[PDB]
Each structure stands twice: as structure tokens, then as C-alpha cells.
Amino acid sequence: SHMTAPVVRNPRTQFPIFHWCRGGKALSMLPKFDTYGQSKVEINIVGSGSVTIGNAHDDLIHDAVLDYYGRRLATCSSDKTIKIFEIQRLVETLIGHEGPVWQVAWAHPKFGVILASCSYDGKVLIWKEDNGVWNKVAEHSVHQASVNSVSWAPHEYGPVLLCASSDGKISIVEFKDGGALEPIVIQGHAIGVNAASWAPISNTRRFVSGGCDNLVKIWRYDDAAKTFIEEEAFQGHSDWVRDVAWSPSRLSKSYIATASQDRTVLIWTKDGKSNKWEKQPLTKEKFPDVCWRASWSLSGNVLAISGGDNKVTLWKENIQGKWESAGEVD
Ligand SMILES: [Ca+2]
Ligand SMILES: [Ca+2]
Ligand SMILES: [Cl-]
Ligand SMILES: [Cl-]
């Protein structure tokens, strides 16, 4: 051929995982290599007793999350599967996805022992444990692209899943009658959506999303419109927003953290008695590599960030409203 336009070649990676206590147990996963240059990816589960699950999958692990009673661990992988451990023994491998599984999320226990998974294959699958055995119970297949995140609503809203896709859309669907049958699907972000997370209960129902237009958006359920409408669109990031986290403190003042492949985290806040949002960078300097995941403690408003620095870094706001390092998880 005769090609005058520039042609480039481009390429996939393992990041750390951490979550705050469930059933008394915190979880961490810090990638390492040994002396033979072999990956050693150990999931540590630490209570007030520690258990280590080594090599849960042979391929990349994209998520690892305990259930709310800290009795089960779900891990998911580029190998297209989800593994369920009782915590240790491997109990089941959940087979159904046709591409990498990016995230899993546990439903509130009032609904049962239920896991949602999202995948490159464009599906959200819902799995349920009954009498110690796992079965696929529903499929939510409205996206025409990778589905990058899944999150269950506050249980007061019902068993409702929030899903973000590379097709630019966000879907919100209630699981009922062994199906996912009446979804709301909205155009969320240009190019793609990477994450969406629920606000804590207020009765206005909100969530926040981040995507490939470098924007963070806040959405509210409108009673008159009977759908979710865009309430805020926050500028600040200079590259794709990779994760968004709405702090579960629900006392007056709201906190949202947004993590970006621009190598920064922005903290957005709104005073209880204000309608105005304000932003502050988490850190004075860029992180060494992308910021991939963010999550807040249940109390104390401590922020955990995972990224290509290969660390889980912790952050705490000081008396003067500035963020300081609180160490890192080992
Ligand atoms: Ca797209
Ligand atoms: Ca999250
Ligand atoms: Cl979860
Ligand atoms: Cl969070």
C-alpha cells in the first residue's frame, strides 16, 4: 500500500488490590516477582489471624473481594473465570464469560449470596449460591462493548446494579424474577465509561461516573423524568478517569475521590450546607504511574489508592483540610 499517514504500534497489566474490613477482615494483594523472575501474586486476608491465598489464577487478577461476612473470597481474571474460595479452600470456578473478567461485586446479604461479574465480553452475569452450590441466574447484556465496572446499590433501593461500559453508556438494572429485565441505559461519557459508584443514602438517589472524556459526572434520579439526569460534570483530569469513589460517610459533608491515568487523584467536596463543590489534588506531585483504583474507609475518611506505582497508598486529611500520607499497605 501507499501510506502517508503516521502509523504507530501499541499494545494487559497487574495492579495492586486492597479493600477495607468485611467480617473483620481486610484484603490486600501486592504484585511481586521472585528470583526466577516469576510472578508471585499473594492475596492476604487479615483479621483481628491472617490467611494467604497464593496464585489464585495463573493469568492476571483484576479483582479480589470478600463477601460481607468475610466467609468467601471471589477473584476474577483475564483467564475468563471467577474463583470462589471459602475462607482456605477453592469451592468453585464460575465459567461463562468469553473474555477477561474485570470486576466482581457482592450483593447485600438480604438478597442472598449473590455475585455480579462484568467482562470484556460485554455481559454482566449474576451468580447465586444455594445450598453450597453456585449457578448462573441472570444475564444483563445491553452493552456493545467491554463492561468495566459493576456496583450494587444501597440495599434500600432494591437489588440494583450499576454498570459502566466502553460503549459510553451506563446501565442501571434491578435483578428480579431470576432476570435483569427493566434496565435504564443512559449515554454517560464520550468515548467510554470506566467506573461508576453509588452515593450513600441521603431521599435523592445519586451516583458518580468517570470516563474517557476526562470528566467526572454526578447523576441524580429524577422523579418527574423517571430516569437519571446529569447533575454535575467536573473538569480537572487531563487523561482518562479510571476510578471514582464516593465516601460512605453520610454526615453533611460529601467526599468523592477520582483516580486518573493522568497519574493524579482529585478530591471533590461539598459542604453540607452548600450546593457548591470544590476540588483539591490529593498530592503535590504526580504519582509515578497511573492511579487505577480508589476506596474509602467506612469511618475516618481514610482513602486507599492503588496504581501502577505497585503500592496501596493511604491518605488522611489534616486539621487544615490538606491531604497527608498515612503510609502504605504491606
Ligand atoms: Ca468506545
Ligand atoms: Ca469501588
Ligand atoms: Cl462488593
Ligand atoms: Cl469507596
Swiss-Prot record:
Q: Which organism is it from?
A: Komagataella phaffii (strain GS115 / ATCC 20864)
Instruction: Tell me which UniProt keywords the record has, alphabetically.
Output: Cytoplasmic vesicle, Endoplasmic reticulum, ER-Golgi transport, Membrane, mRNA transport, Nuclear pore complex, Nucleus, Protein transport, Repeat, Translocation, Transport, WD repeat
Query: What family does the Swiss-Prot or TrEMBL record give for this protein?
Result: Belongs to the WD repeat SEC13 family.
Subcellular localization is given as: Cytoplasmic vesicle, COPII-coated vesicle membrane; Endoplasmic reticulum membrane; Nucleus, Nuclear pore complex
Q: How does it sit in the membrane?
A: Peripheral membrane protein
- Listed GO molecular functions? structural molecule activity
**Could you tell me what this protein is called?**
Protein transport protein SEC13
PANTHER family in the cross-refs: NUCLEAR PORE COMPLEX PROTEIN SEC13 / SEH1 FAMILY MEMBER, PROTEIN SEC13 HOMOLOG
Q: What is the lineage of its organism?
A: Eukaryota, Fungi, Dikarya, Ascomycota, Saccharomycotina
In residue terms, where are the WD repeats? 56-86, 96-128, 142-176, 192-220, 239-269, 286-316
For biological process, the GO terms are: COPII-coated vesicle budding; ERAD pathway; mRNA transport; nuclear pore localization; positive regulation of DNA-templated transcription; positive regulation of ER to Golgi vesicle-mediated transport; positive regulation of protein exit from endoplasmic reticulum; positive regulation of TORC1 signaling
* Annotated transmembrane regions: none
Domain of life where this protein originates:
Eukaryota
Role: Component of the coat protein complex II (COPII) which promotes the formation of transport vesicles from the endoplasmic reticulum (ER). The coat has two main functions, the physical deformation of the endoplasmic reticulum membrane into vesicles and the selection of cargo molecules. It also functions as a component of the nuclear pore complex (NPC). NPC components, collectively referred to as nucleoporins (NUPs), can play the role of both NPC structural components and of docking or interaction partners for transiently associated nuclear transport factors.
Q: Which GO terms describe its cellular component?
A: COPII vesicle coat; endoplasmic reticulum membrane; GATOR2 complex; nuclear pore outer ring
InterPro entries assigned: Sec13/Seh1_fam (IPR037363), WD40/YVTN_repeat-like_dom_sf (IPR015943), WD40_repeat_dom_sf (IPR036322), WD40_rpt (IPR001680)
Known partners and oligomeric status: The COPII coat is composed of at least 5 proteins: the SEC23/24 complex, the SEC13/31 complex, and the protein SAR1. Component of the nuclear pore complex (NPC). NPC constitutes the exclusive means of nucleocytoplasmic transport. NPCs allow the passive diffusion of ions and small molecules and the active, nuclear transport receptor-mediated bidirectional transport of macromolecules such as proteins, RNAs, ribonucleoparticles (RNPs), and ribosomal subunits across the nuclear envelope. Due to its 8-fold rotational symmetry, all subunits are present with 8 copies or multiples thereof.
